[PDB]
Amino acid sequence: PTPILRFVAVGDWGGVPNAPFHTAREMANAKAIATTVKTLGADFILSLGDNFYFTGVHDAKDKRFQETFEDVFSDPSLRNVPWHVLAGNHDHLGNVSAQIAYSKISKRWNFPSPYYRLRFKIPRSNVSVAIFMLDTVTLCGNSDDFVSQQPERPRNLALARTQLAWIKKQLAAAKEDYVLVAGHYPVWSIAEHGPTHCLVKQLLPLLTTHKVTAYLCGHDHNLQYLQDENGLGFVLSGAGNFMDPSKKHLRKVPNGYLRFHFGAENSLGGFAYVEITPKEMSVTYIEASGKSLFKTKLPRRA
Ligand SMILES: *[C@@H]1O[C@H](CO)[C@@H](O[C@@H]2O[C@H](CO)[C@@H](O)[C@H](O)[C@H]2NC(C)=O)[C@H](O)[C@H]1NC(C)=O
C-alpha cells in the first residue's frame, strides 16, 4: 500500500454565540467531515481560524467549547481524531490564551501556543511533513480592530517581529519532504477580504525563497485554490460556517493565479481533504453535501 498521511482542513466553523450555538452550515460540515473520515480516513484535523463566533471565548471554561465545538463534531467517526488549532480575528476579540489552555481539558484539542511547528512521519515511509501553524492576527493585527476590517498593523510590535523571525529561521532550517504553512488570513484571495497586504509583503517572500509546498488559510468564507508561477499552492478553506460568493478582489490577485473557486450562496459550505504520499500531495475540495468539487496535487520538495 502506498504510504499516506491524511487530514481535513476546515476554517471559520465557529458557529454562533446565540442558541443553538451552531449553524445549519456548521452542522452540515460536521456531518460531511464525519463521513469523509469514516470512509477515507484522517490522521488529524486542522482548524484554520475563527473557532468561536463572534468574539471567541471568555476563558478555558467557556460553555462555547462544548456547544460550538465538542457537541457539534460529535459523530462517532470523529471521536478520537486530533485537532490542531490556530486562531482567527474573532478568536482574538476574545481570550485566545483560553483556547490554548483548553488543550489540557479536551484530549483532541491541540493548541500549544499562538504559533508552533508540527512534524509528521508518513507511515511505513521515510518521507516527512512539517506544518507551521501561524497566528496571523498577532503578526498582522486583528481585522476586527479596524473599520476597514483589514489587519492594518499589529497590536504589539515585538510580538509580530518575534513570530516573523521564527518563521524565517524555521523555514530556512526545514528539511521535510513536504512543508506546509497555515494561517487564518489569506495571502491571495479573490473574495470579500481579498489578499492580506501584511502577508503578501512579509510572508510570501519567505514562502517562495524556502520552497514551501502550500499555504493553507481561511478568513474569506468560501473555497479557493490558487497557485503562482512558481507552483506554490494556496489552499483557502473557510466555509465551515458561512458561504459568501463575493469576488470583490478578483482583480487584486495576480492574473492566472485563481485555479478554482466555489462560494455559492445557497451552498452549506465545505472543506479541504489533504492526502500526502511519497509521490505527491493531493488536495480535494469537498462540499458539505459530500461531493468533490475540485482536486489537484502538489510535488514534494527537491
Ligand atoms: C483567559 O483565559 C485564561 C484561561 O481560562 C484565564 O486564566 C485562568 O484564570 C483562573 C481564574 O480563576 C486561574 O485560576 C487559572 O489558573 C487561569 N488559567 C490559566 C491557564 O492561566 C484568564 O483569566 C483569562 N483572561 C481574561 C482576560 O479573560
From Swiss-Prot:
Cofactor(s) needed, names only, are: Fe cation
UniProt EC number: 3.1.3.2
What reaction gets catalysed by this protein? a phosphate monoester + H2O = an alcohol + phosphate
Biological process (GO) annotations held by this record are:
iron ion transport
| Matching InterPro entries | Acid_PPase, Calcineurin-like_PHP_ApaH, Metallo-depent_PP-like, Metallophosphoesterase_PAP
Keyword field: Disulfide bond, Glycoprotein, Hydrolase, Ion transport, Iron, Iron transport, Metal-binding, Secreted, Signal, Transport
Q: Where in the cell is it found?
A: Secreted
Q: Does the keyword Iron apply?
A: yes
Positions bound to Fe cation 2: 50, 89, 184, 219
Gene Ontology cellular component annotations, sorted alphabetically: extracellular region
Q: Which SUPFAM superfamilies match?
A: Metallo-dependent phosphatases (SSF56300)
Q: Which cysteines are joined by disulfide bonds?
A: 140-198
Explain how, and how many, cofactor molecules are bound: Binds 2 iron ions per subunit.
Which residues are noted as glycosylation sites? Answer: 95, 126
Does this entry carry the keyword Ribosomal protein?
Answer: no
A GO term for molecular function = ferrous iron binding
* Binding-site residues for Fe cation 1, renumbered to this chain: 12, 50, 53, 221
Enzyme class comes to hydrolase
Q: What does this protein do?
A: Uteroferrin is a phosphoprotein phosphatase, synthesized in response to progesterone. It appears to function in transplacental transport of iron in pig.
Name of the protein described by the UniProt record: Tartrate-resistant acid phosphatase type 5
Q: Which organism is it from?
A: Sus scrofa (Pig)
The root-end lineage is: Eukaryota, Metazoa, Chordata, Craniata, Vertebrata
The gene coding this protein:
ACP5
